[PDB]
Amino acid sequence: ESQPDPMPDDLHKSSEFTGTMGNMKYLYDDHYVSATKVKSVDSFFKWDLIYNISDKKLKNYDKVKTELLNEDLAKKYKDEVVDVYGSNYYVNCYFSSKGGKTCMYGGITKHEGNHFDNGNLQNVLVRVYENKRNTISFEVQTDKKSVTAQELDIKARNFLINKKNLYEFNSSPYETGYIKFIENNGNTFWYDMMPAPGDKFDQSKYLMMYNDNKTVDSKSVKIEVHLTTKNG
Template identity: 30%
Template sequence: MRKIVNVNFKKFLTSSFLLWVFISAIIPTCYAYEMSSVGVINLRNLYSTYDPTEVKGKINEGPPFSGSLFYKNIPYGNSSIELKVELNSVEKAKFFSGKRVDIFTLEYSPPCNSNIKKNSYGGITLSDGNRIDKKNIPVNIFIDGVQQKYSYTDISTVSTDKKEVTIQELDVKSRYYLQKHFNIYGYGDVKDFGRSSRFQSGFEEGNIIFHLNSGERISYNLFDTGHGDRESMLKKYSDNKTAYSDQLHIDIYLVKFNK
């Protein structure tokens, strides 16, 4: 009798061990898939709707805290919020502190008080002496290496009224144009390029490159989902990179998804 019990107990231990190995193997895969799906949704929501926080002539409240500046009474829907703008250095925050600035940024909600407080990265330029007539930015779009033709009226959405403009502003406007006319993040009206990628579009590879006349190049992966959340997707703007609007052009390279 004892022998039978021992055999059954050993079988139980073996089965339990194998089950544990199976669960340990599948959980990270499921988690990675879940985070990937969340990242796709958040990236789509971030750039498919043109909804930046945009204000002009604001002065921060109080001294800069570390690399952050705080702006109160920022219009937000039918109410107003306090906006924290994070920069990647204390020196940059000190430079803008106490000065009138224009803000063009995408925000994300902090863990608490998300109804009255929002956070963002970069998107700041000085207000005084920086206003110009609307300037359209030259944009070239390539799909699988072939340059695309487009309506000049449509592409004029990538424009600015600032002499010195943040790369964030031009990136946001470019992605909105791409979503509207090429449906790169999926669930749009354009179906010409298919819907077979994980974004339910015809693409999941591509880069946007800002070529400055100084020779500097700033490049972003258009499909980088970060850690899946809005904050990680927006952190790239914390350097508050800028360019003179008459001294740059934009190249966009998309690769069709084939499976």
């Protein structure tokens, strides 16, 4: 079957997080690694792959290490021409390789025949619910037929940050939040959108959820963002 939806107790509450929400916002606000038709060139640990991807933006890195859930997953893509898309971090990003470095998890998709002829992008439906009621609906776009949930998730939150202040420097307008993916085969899974309780946000630990390199069919997958305001 699929992953059971969360119960209010299953979700992180921003009210229980006393750190700087800006460090969560940072991961999704016009922040991401993107590369097309590349192959890994090294590996730190057997479950990760390293690519030569440069920071077109601010030249902050030219080497990117992506960690996967296990060796098989890393073995699968080691010698393949792929595309990369994910949210990177620097705090506690470590690895040597024989130029700045940056880190991430999952985000790999085979490049061969996974694109649309002539710059055609695929729209994906995202419906936002605030306190159980659909408030706004929109679409995010991707250039891949089979895209990682991470890519879609990142794009959804980028949008919500700008238009719903999903994340602010200190705290958020919402108490709980989770993004749910529904596949055309009935299978569903979700991610908690709030930081773990406490006074410090561990970017590396949080992004590790994109570990599984979960992919979905962009032309048929649907997305639902469920949020709640503290009181209502």
